[PDB]
Amino acid sequence: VHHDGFQTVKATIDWEHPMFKLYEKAKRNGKWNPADIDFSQDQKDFASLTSEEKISALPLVAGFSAGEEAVTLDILPMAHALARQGRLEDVLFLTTFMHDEAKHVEMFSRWQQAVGIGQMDLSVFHNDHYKRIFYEALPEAMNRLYADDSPEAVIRAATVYNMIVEGTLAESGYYTFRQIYKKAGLFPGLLQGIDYLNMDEGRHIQFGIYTIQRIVNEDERYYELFIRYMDELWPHVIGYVDYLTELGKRQQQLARTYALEIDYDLLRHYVIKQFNLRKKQISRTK
Amino acid sequence: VHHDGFQTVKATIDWEHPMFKLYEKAKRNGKWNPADIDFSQDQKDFASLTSEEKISALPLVAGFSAGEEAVTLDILPMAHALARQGRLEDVLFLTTFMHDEAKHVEMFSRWQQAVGIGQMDLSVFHNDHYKRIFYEALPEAMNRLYADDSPEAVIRAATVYNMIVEGTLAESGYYTFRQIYKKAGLFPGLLQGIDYLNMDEGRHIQFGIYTIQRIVNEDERYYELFIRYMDELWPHVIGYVDYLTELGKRQQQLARTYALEIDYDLLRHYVIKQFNLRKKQISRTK
Ligand SMILES: CCCCCCCCCCCCCCCC(=O)O
Ligand SMILES: CCCCCCCCCCCCCCCC(=O)O
Ligand SMILES: [Fe+2]
Ligand SMILES: [Fe+2]
Ligand SMILES: [Fe+2]
Ligand SMILES: [Fe+2]
Ligand SMILES: [Mn+2]
Ligand SMILES: [Mn+2]
Numbered sequence A, B: 001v002h003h004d005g006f007q008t009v010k011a012t013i014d015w016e017h018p019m020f021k022l023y024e025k026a027k028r029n030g031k032w033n034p035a036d037i038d039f040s041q042d043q044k045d046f047a048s049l050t051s052e053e054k055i056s057a058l059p060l061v062a063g064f065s066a067g068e069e070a071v072t073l074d075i076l077p078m079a080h081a082l083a084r085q086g087r088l089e090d091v092l093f094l095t096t097f098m099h100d101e102a103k104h105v106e107m108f109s110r111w112q113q114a115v116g117i118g119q120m121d122l123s124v125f126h127n128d129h130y131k132r133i134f135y136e137a138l139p140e141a142m143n144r145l146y147a148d149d150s151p152e153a154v155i156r157a158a159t160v161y162n163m164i165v166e167g168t169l170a171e172s173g174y175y176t177f178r179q180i181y182k183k184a185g186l187f188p189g190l191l192q193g194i195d196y197l198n199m200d201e202g203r204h205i206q207f208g209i210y211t212i213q214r215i216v217n218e219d220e221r222y223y224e225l226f227i228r229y230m231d232e233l234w235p236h237v238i239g240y241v242d243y244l245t246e247l248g249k250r251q252q253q254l255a256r257t258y259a260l261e262i263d264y265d266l267l268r269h270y271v272i273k274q275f276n277l278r279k280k281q282i283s284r285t286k
Helices: A018-029 A040-048 A051-074 A076-084 A088-115 A128-146 A151-184 A188-216 A221-250 A253-257 A264-280 B018-029 B040-048 B051-074 B076-084 B088-115 B128-146 B151-184 B188-216 B221-250 B253-257 B264-280
Strands: none
Touching: A018 A088, A018 A188, A040 A088, A040 A188, A051 A076, A051 A088, A051 A128, A051 A151, A051 A221, A051 A253, A051 B088, A076 A088, A076 A128, A076 A151, A076 B076, A088 A188, A088 B051, A088 B088, A128 A151, A128 A221, A151 A188, A151 A221, A151 A264, A188 A221, A221 A264, B018 B088, B018 B188, B040 B088, B040 B188, B051 B076, B051 B088, B051 B128, B051 B151, B051 B221, B051 B253, B076 B088, B076 B128, B076 B151, B088 B188, B128 B151, B128 B221, B151 B188, B151 B221, B151 B264, B188 B221, B221 B264
């Protein structure tokens, strides 16, 4: 359908819009390029691991590559919905969001190639709960926006994408990886990538908070919706966590070799903390 | 609809894909930030112009702000269509495309704000032909992709967007602006912006060429389609050119003051040359 007119012809960008400001910060702080990361030491590290230590790392990496690829593809309907509502500043920022995700996908894929597992099919580490979230719920919620951009639909999309996938699962995956491998002294290129990634993701979650809050500000009923959509996904969030946790207990060789007490009962609780923390960033009234 | 699996979990990015290579070049060469451009001299220049010299500049600027805003919004359906076909490398590159366009919109809008015409509604310089292209044909062709991603639909979208709007009209607008104001010594910030813009747009047109050619390579019948879609839009392309040309002849004050022989009959022919040149970049057989 036709453009009615154009905001930067009738007027200008809203320079004070929070999403314009977030866009400006993204440009400033979004310069990293995964093509510059030196993965040579990661190649050596991975090779020096035993076969059993080798796999220990793979489930988490499987979750991340899939996850970044899904969020790269699945933001597109949000950008469309907000474009069609005339939210130009949101769209500008979302170009940075989408390009960040592209770099995230690229980074993990480069790591896989470099350490020599690119030819391996890591889908084997996606259990039913992981699939429910990333192969199904996430694309369903986002694609819905093409035909239904109601407040309810937009809140649900931001909840699944920004608050659960990014704000709970991803945030926890950064923590877990850092905790295990930073302590080991392993995979410096990957950790550098994860650090840059974590910085970008700070902006993404702010967009999700802005989007959910601005809808909740129209009508408190929508607060209940937000809490409910969070709770509906929890079982799959924890059901994936348990499955990982449990894999990692069956191959604790990397833990004993590099002698780090991997407290799964501490990661499990970080995931719980993340989830509750995301709830608190939305208020019934603000 | 569900993700079947993920390319960077089953395998890796296709590092040799032409669009992956274009993506890598975009990251390297796409660092500029319109927020860094110094527009202070442009403010002085514009103020020092007479009222009649002032407007001389505005039609072209009106066409560009509208144009950048439209292409920012209207690439989204192409990214969707190619995502859904599993063309991950194209999608990665398209994140750079979309973010470039965001910077383009931002740049013109910053210039308008800086010289003090942000409050002016420049829609008055969009005639019927301009509207036919930018308010109508462009969004129609792109939005079609949501429900019809046939080769015919994808060729038509790339033709209107990449070959006509970018490759013919925009390319000619860069040339025209440089020709007039570079010679005058005016609007250095805007010209710097236009130079950065022109560099980005080199990549955009390569994507359009890749996309049209790869479809034409499946079936030569599609070459005829491409030439025909080009010709269908020409009347609106030249009909906008005439309207500009004609405005610029009625207010030739800026020409006489800054004493530059604005050869409209040379710009008109550049637009003709651009158009024919774009045709030549697609071969019936390649
Ligand atoms: C054993 C502790 C469990 C830790 C949880 C691990 C979660 C794996 C993370 C995969 C999600 C990646 C999604 C990307 C989101 C984004 O890029 O915006
Ligand atoms: C008098 C000579 C006529 C010159 C033609 C002027 C054309 C104005 C250009 C407006 C189009 C801008 C579209 C942006 C395309 C893109 O950013 O990829
Ligand atoms: Fe993200
Ligand atoms: Fe289960
Ligand atoms: Fe472009
Ligand atoms: Fe006409
Ligand atoms: Mn990410
Ligand atoms: Mn542009």
